[PDB]
C-alpha cells in the first residue's frame, strides 16, 4: 500500500510531507516533488518562526503549517530544509517562455531560517554552505515524451502531491478575498480624504454593500485578462486519463500520494471538485494500492 | 514673481495640484519636468475605473478622481500618459547600484480608452504615430551628483519640484502598516476555522486584534525586527536638506511649482520628525526661492465652492 492523504488547502502538504520523514514512508531528504498544479505555488516566504526550529518535532510542523503557511508558499521551506532535491511541476498548459531545468538554490539571510533568499547562481560565499540548497524546477507536460536519462533522473522517491484545480479552474473565484467590516469603517474609507486604507492599498482593492453588511475587497481578479479554465466532466476525464498515461509511460512509483481539493479556496469548481476527486481515486486505484485517508486523522494523532 | 508653492498631507494629492497648477497656468500643459524628490519611485502603474480623459475635463473631475482611486504610489504614470510631464528625474539617498542612465519608456491606455494603463520599455509598431501612446524618460539622481552642462541643460526645462519629506528620513514599517475594523463574525471565523481564506492566501503576512472591545484585520511584516531602518538624526536631515539645496543652486533650477507632502499620516515620515523636517526644508528653500506656502486644503476650497 503506498501512502494516500486528502486535504481541504494545499498548506497542509507541508505538515503531510514531514509527518511521512517522522513515520519513514519518505526519506529525510533527496526526495522528488511531482507538483501536480494549475499554479506553481513557488511564493518565496519571509517567515517568523526559523525553518531550523520547525522541523524539531511533529507538533511544532502542525502549527507551523496552520500559522504562517499559505496555500502558495510551502514548497521553497521544504527545499530550504532539504526534502526535496528536484521539483516537477505539470501543467495543462505552460507559458512558452519558461522551458527546460532551472538550476536554483535557495538560503536564508544570515543563517536564521526566516527570510528566504532564491538565487539561479550559487554566491562565491554560500560554497560549501549548509545553510544554502541547491536544487532543480522543471516545466513539464501529461502528453511530453520523457527521454530514459530524464525519466531516470524523475524517478527517484517520487511524491504524487495533485491539486484538483490541474484538472478544472476558476482563478475568479480563488483570486478574490474579502473581509466583513463594519459601517464605521466602510464609510471613513469612501470619505476620509486620508483614509491609510484607500491610499496605501492599490490593485482593484474596493469597500461593497450587500445584505446590509460592509466588506473589504482586498483582491479582486481581473476579470478581462481572466482565462476560462472550467471544463466540462468528460474533458475532467480525458485530462486525468492522461495523467495515469504520464505515471504509467514513465513506470512511477510514488512513497507517498496526496490529494488537495482546494474547493474552499474556491480554485476548484464548487460544483466539479466532488466529480474530479472520485474519479482521480478511482483511475489512480487502477495502477496504485492505498487506502485514502483525509489529514484530520493525522492531525487527531499529533493533537493527542 | 513667487513661486506658487503647495503642501499635502499624502502623495495622491499631488495629481490634484499638477492638473490645477495647468488650469491656473502656473505651468503649460506638456512638456514639464517632474523634479521627484523622494525616498519611493511611487511609479505603480494603476488600472482606472474611470477614464484619464473624462478626469481632465475640469477640475472637480480630477479633485473627485484624486480622493477615489489614486493611491501615494500610482499618481506619477497618470499624469505621464495625460503628457503633463515629458521626463521624471527621480533623487533618492541611496539608488539601486542596477539602476543607471536614462530608461526610455512609453505608456498607452488598453484600446484608447484611457482607464487601463500599459507601460513599455520600446515603442511597439502599433504605438508608433499613436497619439494616446505618450514617449518619456525616468532617470535615477543624486544630490551629490556633477551634472554636465550637456545633462543640466536637458534637465532645468519647466522643473516641477516634487519632494516628499520621508527622502530626508523614512519609516517604511511604520508606512506599510494597514489595519481595518471589522466585525465580531469575521473575526471569530478568522479565529477558529482554519481553511478561512484570508488565513490559508496571506498566512504571517496578516493578523487579528481586539483592542477596547473592537476586532481589526491587520497587515503586518513578518520578521519586523530585522526589516530596515532609514530613520536618520537631525543633524542627518540637515546635511541631506543642504546638499538638495546645493544641488538646487549648482544646476540654477527654477521651479514653476513646487509642492511638498509630509507622509506622516501613512507614518512613512517618523511623527516626532515631520514638523522639523518640514519647517527646516521651508527655511533653506527660502534662502534660494521666493514663496508663500499654501496648504492643498486652499485649493480643494476654491473647487468645491
Ligand atoms: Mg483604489
Ligand atoms: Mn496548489
Ligand atoms: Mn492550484
Ligand atoms: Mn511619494
Ligand atoms: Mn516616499
Known amino acids: 500500500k503506498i501512502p494516500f492523504y486528502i486535504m481541504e488547502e494545499h498548506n497542509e502538504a507541508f505538515f503531510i510531507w514531514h509527518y511521512a520523514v517522522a513515520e519513514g514512508w519518505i526519506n529525510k531528504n533527496q526526495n522528488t516533488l511531482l507538483h501536480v498544479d494549475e499554479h506553481s505555488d513557488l511564493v518565496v516566504p519571509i517567515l517568523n518562526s526559523s525553518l531550523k526550529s520547525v522541523n524539531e518535532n511533529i507538533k511544532?510542523?502542525?502549527?507551523?503549517?496552520?500559522?504562517?503557511?499559505?496555500?502558495?508558499?510551502?514548497?521553497?521551506?521544504?527545499?530550504?530544509?532539504?526534502?526535496?532535491?528536484?521539483?516537477?511541476?505539470?501543467?495543462?498548459?505552460?507559458?512558452?517562455?519558461?522551458?527546460?531545468?532551472?538550476?536554483?538554490?535557495?538560503?536564508?539571510?544570515?543563517?536564521?531560517?526566516?527570510?528566504?533568499?532564491?538565487?539561479?547562481?550559487?554566491?562565491?560565499?554560500?560554497?560549501?554552505?549548509?545553510?544554502?540548497?541547491?536544487f532543480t524546477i522543471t516545466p513539464l507536460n501529461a502528453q511530453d515524451d520523457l527521454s530514459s536519462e530524464e525519466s531516470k533522473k524523475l524517478n527517484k522517491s517520487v511524491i504524487l502531491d495533485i491539486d484538483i484545480d490541474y484538472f478544472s479552474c476558476d482563478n475568479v473565484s480563488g483570486e478574490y478575498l474579502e473581509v466583513e467590516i463594519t459601517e464605521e469603517a466602510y464609510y471613513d474609507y469612501i470619505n476620509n480624504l486620508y483614509n491609510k486604507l484607500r491610499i496605501c492599498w492599490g490593485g482593484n482593492a474596493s469597500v461593497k454593500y450587500m445584505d446590509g453588511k460592509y466588506y473589504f475587497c482586498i483582491?479582486?481578479?481581473?476579470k478581462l485578462v481572466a482565462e476560462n479554465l472550467k471544463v466540462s466532466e468528460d474533458a475532467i476525464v480525458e485530462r486525468i486519463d492522461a495523467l495515469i498515461d504520464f505515471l504509467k509511460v514513465?513506470?512511477?512509483?510514488?512513497?507517498?500520494?496526496?490529494?488537495?481539493?482546494?474547493?474552499?479556496?474556491?480554485?476548484?469548481?464548487?460544483?466539479?471538485?466532488?466529480?474530479?476527486?472520485?474519479?482521480?481515486?478511482?483511475?489512480?486505484?487502477?495502477?496504485?494500492?492505498?487506502?485514502?485517508?483525509?489529514?484530520?486523522?493525522?492531525?487527531?494523532?499529533?493533537?493527542?
Open 250 to 304: 514513465n513506470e512511477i512509483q510514488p512513497k507517498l500520494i496526496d490529494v488537495c481539493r482546494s474547493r474552499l479556496s474556491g480554485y476548484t469548481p464548487n460544483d466539479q471538485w466532488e466529480f474530479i476527486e472520485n474519479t482521480l481515486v478511482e483511475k489512480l486505484s487502477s495502477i496504485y494500492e492505498f487506502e485514502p485517508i483525509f489529514v484530520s486523522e493525522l492531525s487527531k494523532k499529533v493533537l493527542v
Open 60 to 134: 511544532r510542523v502542525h502549527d507551523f503549517t496552520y500559522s504562517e503557511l499559505t496555500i502558495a508558499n510551502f514548497i521553497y521551506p521544504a527545499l530550504y530544509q532539504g526534502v526535496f532535491s528536484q521539483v516537477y511541476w505539470l501543467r495543462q498548459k505552460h507559458d512558452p517562455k519558461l522551458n527546460g531545468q532551472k538550476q536554483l538554490n535557495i538560503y536564508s539571510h544570515q543563517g536564521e531560517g526566516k527570510r528566504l533568499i532564491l538565487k539561479s547562481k550559487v554566491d562565491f560565499n554560500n560554497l560549501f554552505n549548509p545553510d544554502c540548497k541547491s
Open 219 to 222: 483582491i479582486q481578479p481581473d
